[PDB]
Ligand binder design. Structure first.
Ligand SMILES: CC(C)CCn1nc(-c2cccs2)c(O)c(C2=Nc3ccc(NS(C)(=O)=O)cc3S(=O)(=O)N2)c1=O
Length: 557
């Protein structure tokens, strides 16, 4: 069937949309080539609609069914709980889209009886009706990039009341099931450092390693009714409350499988017969389905000693090489199998024989050295999109602060330490907002973070070496430098100079601020300070951080 059917009604914005980089007095200090930075808007949604709209054919063989049977046997060991209304309410982000039924996210969060009473009526309807298609809103995402323009990605989501019900029924499932079913292959269980450790140990476990990323063209669109019904059969293997079982069945038939699409003006835009990008099960559904298809495809291609790492629609495989000719042929067969399973490639996969050249989750393993001179592996990425988004965030307040997320996830990197830390700590110092908690996203879920906690966060996630890495690789330094030239970002020597000032200003304020100066900016000074474990670091509750993925899933932790 067709992934989408369209009526011709446009995908409409809620409010005015900026596509051009906003500029203030701080912009030039970061980036001079403003015209290179843009945000996507609903006005390019037509282009996206064209790309995501196609027929899906699916041919399912014994490998597919064999892997599914294995997955189900593991799912059957999972026991999952129903969340209360109140528990589900507390998982709603403060900025989540308001209900069409007279209440918003903040009414959900502080648990007003209007919100709570509607939520109950939604739940009751789910239990009583397993057929009526549930309404969804289709919107265009506003995301920032550097020109290379990408059309807007689409987001499809049900009403706020339904989203809370999804959490009640499925939050425990989507949080616990994927690691049980997929074990070490489940990517969202890893911090960046643990991801590096897994990739490196896997690479080294092979006699002659080969790895590749597989890019599915428009993954959500390739997901079929079969796929979504199979995913439900996996959920239903769990030990569940009777009401959970019914709600999951109902959500599957009425929402997950497909449904009508409505724009922000209330017009019917058409119909979806593929994955909704804005449901709770988006991440877990995509992970299970990608893993199922890929595992079966590995068997079809007879890949030798293959290890998979899956994060939603993101796939990387490491296996034993048979030489370049046989590897290329193996991947073509793998790709043929994936295509039959309705997961055709965007760019055809290519075998890689250098781990540092494998890009997965937009990231790669690289190498630097700690204070002792000992090689340390760490995760990095091309800094282009992070810097483009930081530029937007320099002039505009955003609901999600990518700079803060990037500092957390990419703390050991050259570009995050020298540029992101320096730039944004300077901004926080000048406003005296160091103590003000900010929202960021990690694996799809929203977290409120105090920037003054960064040293403890970084020590806990990455270890003290993150504050002492040096002697980065020629490939990494060159990539950072090339990016700076492209965006017109000042050279790293300027950032070192600025950092010396930022560090001194932080130290002068004492307390947590001085700790930020000491640890985050020890790189900036000729004669360093001795870096010891921060006492307050053990106090932070970082449970729940790298448990599961929740992209589009409306989760606040
Ligand atoms: C450093 C780490 C270890 C690697 C790079 N990286 N970085 C980030 C962050 C960097 C700064 C702040 S979050 C991150 O949140 C993700 C990430 N991965 C995903 C991959 C694939 C999907 N596809 S789906 C829609 O679920 O089918 C969704 C996600 S996600 O939205 O959950 N986020 C990530 O992979």
């Amino acid at each position: 069937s067709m992934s989408y059917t369209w009526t011709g009604a446009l995908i409409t914005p809620c409010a005015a949309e900026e596509s051009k980089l906003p500029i203030n007095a701080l912009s030039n200090s970061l980036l001079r080539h403003h015209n290179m930075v843009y945000a996507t808007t609903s006005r390019s949604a037509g282009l996206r609609q064209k790309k995501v709209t196609f027929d899906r054919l699916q041919v399912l063989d014994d490998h597919y069914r064999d892997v599914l049977k294995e997955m189900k046997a593991k799912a059957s060991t999972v026991k999952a709980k129903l969340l209360s209304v109140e528990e589900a309410c507390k998982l709603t982000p403060p900025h989540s889209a308001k209900s069409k039924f007279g209440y918003g996210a903040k009414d959900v969060r502080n648990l007003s009886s209007k919100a709570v009473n509607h939520i109950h009526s939604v739940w009751k309807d789910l239990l009583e009706d397993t057929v009526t298609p549930i309404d969804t809103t289709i919107m265009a995402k506003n995301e920032v990039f550097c020109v290379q323009r990408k059309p807007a990605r689409l987001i499809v989501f049900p009403d706020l009341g339904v989203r809370v019900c999804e959490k009640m029924a499925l939050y425990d499932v989507v949080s616990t099931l994927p690691q049980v079913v997929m074990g070490s292959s489940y990517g969202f269980q890893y911090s960046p450092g643990q991801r590096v450790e897994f990739l490196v140990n896997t690479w080294k476990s092979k006699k002659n390693p080969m790895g590749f990323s597989y890019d599915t063209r428009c993954f959500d669109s390739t997901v079929t009714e079969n796929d979504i019904r199979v995913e439900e059969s996996i959920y239903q293997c769990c030990d569940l409350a009777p009401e959970a079982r019914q709600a999951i069945k109902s959500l599957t038939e009425r929402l997950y499988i497909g449904g009508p699409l409505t724009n922000s003006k209330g017009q019917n835009c058409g119909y979806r017969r593929c994955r909704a990008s804005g449901v709770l099960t988006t991440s877990c559904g995509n992970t299970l389905t990608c893993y199922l298809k890929a595992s079966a495809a590995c068997r079809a291609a007879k890949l030798q000693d293959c290890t998979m790492l899956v994060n939603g629609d993101d796939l990387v495989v490491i296996c034993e090489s048979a030489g370049t000719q046989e590897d290329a042929a193996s991947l073509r067969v793998f790709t043929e199998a994936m295509t039959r399973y309705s997961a055709p490639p965007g760019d055809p996969p290519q075998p890689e024989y250098d781990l540092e050249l494998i890009t997965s989750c937009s990231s790669n393993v690289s190498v630097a050295h700690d204070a002792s001179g000992k090689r340390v592996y760490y995760l990095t990425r091309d800094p282009t999109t992070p810097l483009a988004r930081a530029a937007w965030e320099t002039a505009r307040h955003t609901p999600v602060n990518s700079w803060l997320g990037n500092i957390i996830m990419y703390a050991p990197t050259l570009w995050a330490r020298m540029i992101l830390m320096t730039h944004f700590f300077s901004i926080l110092l000048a406003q005296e907002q160091l103590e003000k908690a900010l929202d960021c996203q990690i694996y799809g879920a929203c977290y409120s973070i105090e920037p003054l906690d960064l040293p403890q966060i970084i020590e806990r996630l990455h270890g003290l070496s993150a504050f002492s890495l040096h002697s980065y690789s020629p490939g990494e330094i060159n990539r950072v430098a090339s990016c700076l030239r492209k965006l017109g970002v000042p050279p790293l020597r300027v950032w070192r100079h600025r950092a010396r000032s930022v560090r001194a200003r932080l130290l002068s304020q004492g307390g947590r601020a001085a700790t930020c100066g000491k640890y985050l900016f020890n790189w900036a000074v000729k004669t360093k300070l001795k870096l010891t474990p921060i006492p307050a670091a053990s106090q932070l509750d970082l449970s729940g951080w790298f448990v599961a993925g929740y992209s589009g899933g409306d989760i606040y932790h």
